[PDB]
Amino acid sequence: EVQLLESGPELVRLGASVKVSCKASGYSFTDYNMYWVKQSHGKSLEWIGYIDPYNGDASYNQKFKGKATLTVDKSSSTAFMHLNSLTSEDSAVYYCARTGYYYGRSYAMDYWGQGTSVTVSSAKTAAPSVYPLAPVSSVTLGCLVKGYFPEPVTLTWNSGSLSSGVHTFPAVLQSDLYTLSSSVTVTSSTWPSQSITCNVAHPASSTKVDKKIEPR
Amino acid sequence: DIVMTQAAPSVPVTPGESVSISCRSSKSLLHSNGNTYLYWFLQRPGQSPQLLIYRMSNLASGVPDRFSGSGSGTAFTLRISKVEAEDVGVYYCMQHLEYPYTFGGGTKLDVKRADAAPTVSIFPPSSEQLTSGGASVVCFLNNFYPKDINVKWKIDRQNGVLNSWTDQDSKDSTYSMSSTLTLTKDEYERHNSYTCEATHKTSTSPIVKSFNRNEC
């Protein structure tokens, strides 16, 4: 199975630069061109350019000419994308993706990495404050992750064991700060007869905390 | 630049029936070598894009037989026969003929399941949040269909509301929304009742979930 593993999320100051990486496995890295794609928050897709890991020649999109630079490391089977002088319009998700080539024909972007979210902002990393959401047949519980920056944050309930009946909602901004929300639904005979907490981890601020849902 | 156009932004489809996603290009994608360099990609919710069809009519590895690709030189069609619940996502077309490579706007596929009423649960602000000032009133509306639904906040109708939707679920084809009334400790403790009115197509009168500040 072909695997493309990309760099983690990044927070970059305005005007600064970032270098995202894409480590390939499951095939000979130098045999195929690595494409790069920008996806904006409106989920629209743009082709940035590609790099031939062998000779190292790279073709670029005219719009991203001068902003993107593609390189490669054969010793670690990794493609890299450098983006300089970043602005708010550069805040997006960037994908790398292999393009197959067999017997004279091409297979464009046949396998994609998980993507790398880039955030361009002057704001500083703020730690989240998590709050247990207790209620006032089946009872729903909640966990509120409010006031953190930047994305992302991981959320589980019983250390990942309780996965079914969970709705973890996308983060939304409010005055330059993210708010995350999640709700778990279980039978009335399970709570509060059985304990259930909330595992929230914010790596950018290095914060991992647990909040048991307590009755009011 | 070649401009790819997908006119329909969304197509409502009941499971078991066929769908056609259209894509037109500003120029013929027919190459002298006989192939047509049109590409279909799929992006499932929360996932990376995946190759669906390469060069107009060829299915990528593992792609269900239900999918097929056709077209002339300008007009192209992705026929998805017998839609399943896991076909939900955005379908993009892409031309691979000329530089720079360009993508369509994308067509969101929504599965038309049986209408489901929202399960509403309201949650008073946690004690931990009131201690540090500020009070968030959280309201969940889970597993409903269609997506169209209005959420109203009656205190004694105000603003400062932060809404968030999940994508259509891959399994049960439903939607979920998390509405959060963000208030201050001084504004919260000044008023008493807090209701979460929800108006949906599957509803006589709206669904109401409420509480009062000093009752429990």
Author numbering:
A (entry chain H): 1 to 52, 52A, 53 to 82, 82A, 82B, 82C, 83 to 100, 100A, ...
B (entry chain L): 1 to 30, 30A, 30B, 30C, 30D, 30E, 31 to 151, 155 to 214
Can you provide the manuscript's text about this entry?
GroEL is a molecular chaperone found in many bacteria, whose expression is upregulated during stress conditions, such as elevated temperatures or high concentration of oxygen radicals. In the current study, we generated and characterized 13 IgG2a mAbs specific for FtGroEL. And we map their partially overlapping target epitopes and those of three mAbs with other crossblocking profiles (Ab53, N3 and N30) by hydrogen/deuterium exchange - mass spectrometry (DXMS) and visualization on a homology model of FtGroEL. Further validation of the FtGroEL homology model was obtained by determining the X-ray crystal structures of Ab53 and Ab64 Fabs at 2.5 and 2.6 Å resolution, respectively.
